[PDB]
């Protein structure tokens, strides 16, 4: 009764008792911080203080701009979406301009990409609205019903942008600037 039965009886063996040499090796490992090319994984509290998902968006915007080809931009966008970092106006505009420039891409794919970006959270802006308007104007081969359906979305988006602009310019009493923006709208 002195030595407990649980330490020498094989019937009471612990099924999931790891050995002494395994867990220490498991926790000793320091995996590489370059899980993704653009950013570095933080290993120290200082690196964690510097690290932020929103800040990674700036570096991804820079790398996307440095990329010269739409397939490379798409690969970088896939990496960014897999990382889950924030997607904003800068990446939306730089992606849409190259998608519009590219000819091999169907004009529906760029609209789908814009819709999924605005679903991810990147708020629309006037430059992206202009790019989508250009694609809609250069989408002759597509059905007229499709063009009209996307025209409704474009016009409501422009109305939303105008409302946001007037809301953000009302307090500062910049009547001339507000009129100038609304002339473009």
């Amino acid at each position: 009764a002195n030595i407990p039965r649980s330490v020498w009886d094989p019937a009471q063996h612990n099924p999931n008792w790891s050995d002494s040499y395994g867990h220490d090796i498991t926790n000793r490992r320091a995996w590489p911080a370059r899980k993704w090319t653009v950013g570095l994984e933080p290993c120290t509290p200082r690196e964690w203080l510097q690290f932020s998902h929103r800040n990674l968006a700036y570096a991804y915007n820079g790398a996307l701009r440095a990329c010269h080809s739409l397939p490379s931009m798409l690969l970088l966008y896939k990496e960014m979406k897999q990382r889950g970092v924030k997607v904003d106006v800068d990446t939306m505009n730089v992606l849409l301009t190259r998608a519009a420039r590219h000819e091999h891409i169907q004009v529906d794919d760029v609209f789908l990409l814009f819709d999924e970006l605005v679903a991810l959270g990147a708020r629309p802006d006037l430059a992206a609205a202009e790019t989508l308007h250009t694609v809609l104007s250069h989408s002759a081969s597509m059905p007229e019903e499709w063009r009209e359906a996307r025209r409704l979305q474009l016009v409501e988006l422009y109305n939303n942008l105008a409302m946001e602009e007037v809301e953000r310019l009302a307090p500062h009493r910049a009547d001339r600037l507000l009129k100038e923006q609304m002339k473009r709208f």
């Binding site: 094989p10 019937a11 063996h13 099924p15």
Partner: peptide, 20 residues
């Protein structure tokens, strides 16, 4: 719930990991 627990652990002098 180890399989063949009686023969492997409580029946074998090697606990199934010793090649006699």
């Amino acid at each position: 719930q180890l399989q063949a627990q009686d023969r492997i652990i409580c029946g074998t002098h090697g606990a199934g990991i010793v090649a006699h």
